[PDB]
């Protein structure tokens, strides 16, 4: 479970890229997985069947290796029956995004320097990870908690915190990078002291 870290150790090669596949079937989920591991040497992070019956693949490697594994993976997935629901290929994922991939991490406390909070939910996992990556890159926000299609039937949400202007810039970039996959966004400009830090409980 130490393969989800941002930087590798000194005796390991560097793998900054990321690729997320989301498939309506589980059988060709495994076919897409080992085809992508046949073509290019991508370290596969997970091959996990998540709720609403869909298989979620996450792979990690260098930029060319992840790109080549993803082009093999999408020439296998779209074979007659279009069972590729959504895809994502980040050439460089943000450092605060890596440890929210394996398990659903929830947040229990904030700091006193937390003005505002934004909660984003998308219909897919790929749109959630894409919008979280874009919003972490463009603005000094902190990703607090994130759920990816387990227990909530395919939907995926995440919350960011920070200054109100920063989380509204993140709201703009999330609404641009999702477009039609964003279900509904909420911009809490000042959360209640009975709810700061402890939202889902």
Partner 1 sequence: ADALGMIEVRGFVGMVEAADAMVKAAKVELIGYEKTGGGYVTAVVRGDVAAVKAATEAGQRAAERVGEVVAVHVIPRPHVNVDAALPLGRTP
Interface positions with partner 1 (CB under 8 A): 14, 16, 38-41, 62-65, 67-68, 91-92, 137-140, 163-166, 168-169
Q: Which is nearer to partner 1, 67 or 102 (CB)?
A: 67
DSSP, collapsed to helix, strand or coil, labels residue 199 as coil
Q: Which is nearer to partner 1, 150 or 164 (CB)?
A: 164
Q: How far is the CB of 198 from partner 1 (least distance, A)?
A: 27
Query: Which residue, chain included where needed, has tokens 């370290």?
Result: 43
C-alpha 196/C-alpha 115 separation (Å) is: 10
Name the residue nearer to partner 1 (CB basis): 61 or 154: 61
Q: What are the CA-CA distances from residue 159 to residues 12, 99, 119, 178, 186 (Å)?
A: 32, 14, 4, 15, 10
Nearer to partner 1, 167 or 178 (CB): 167
Q: Minimal distance in Å, beta carbon 78 to partner 1?
A: 16
Measured in degrees and rounded to the nearest 5, phi and psi for residue 192 equal -75, 150
> For 40-185, where are the alpha helices, taking DSSP H only?
63-77, 126-138, 164-178
Rounded Cα gap, residues 93 and 91, in angstroms? 7
Q: Tell me the closest approach of the beta carbon of residue 76 to partner 1, in angstroms.
A: 13
Residue 88 Cβ vs partner 1, minimum distance, rounded to whole Å = 14
């Amino acid at each position: 479970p130490e393969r989800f870290d941002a930087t590798p150790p000194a005796g390991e090669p560097d793998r900054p890229a990321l690729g997320v596949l989301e498939l309506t079937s589980i059988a060709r989920g495994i076919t897409v997985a080992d085809a992508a591991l046949k073509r290019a040497p991508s370290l596969l992070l997970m091959s996990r069947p998540v709720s609403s019956g869909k298989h979620l693949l996450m792979m990690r490697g260098q930029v060319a290796e992840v790109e080549e594994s993803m082009i093999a993976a999408r020439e296998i997935a779209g074979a007659g029956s279009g069972a590729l629901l959504d895809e994502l290929e980040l050439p460089y994922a943000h450092e605060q995004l890596w440890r929210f991939l394996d398990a659903p991490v929830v947040a229990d406390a904030w700091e006193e320097d937390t003005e505002s909070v934004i909660i984003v939910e998308t219909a897919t996992v790929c749109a959630a990870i894409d919008s979280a990556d874009a919003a972490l890159k463009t603005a000094p926000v902190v990703l607090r908690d994130m759920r990816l299609a387990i227990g909530i039937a395919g939907k995926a949400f995440f919350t960011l915190t920070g200054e109100l202007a920063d989380v509204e810039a993140a709201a703009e970039v999330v609404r641009e990078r999702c477009g039609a996959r964003l279900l509904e966004l909420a911009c809490i400009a000042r959360p209640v002291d009975e709810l700061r830090g402890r939202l889902f409980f």
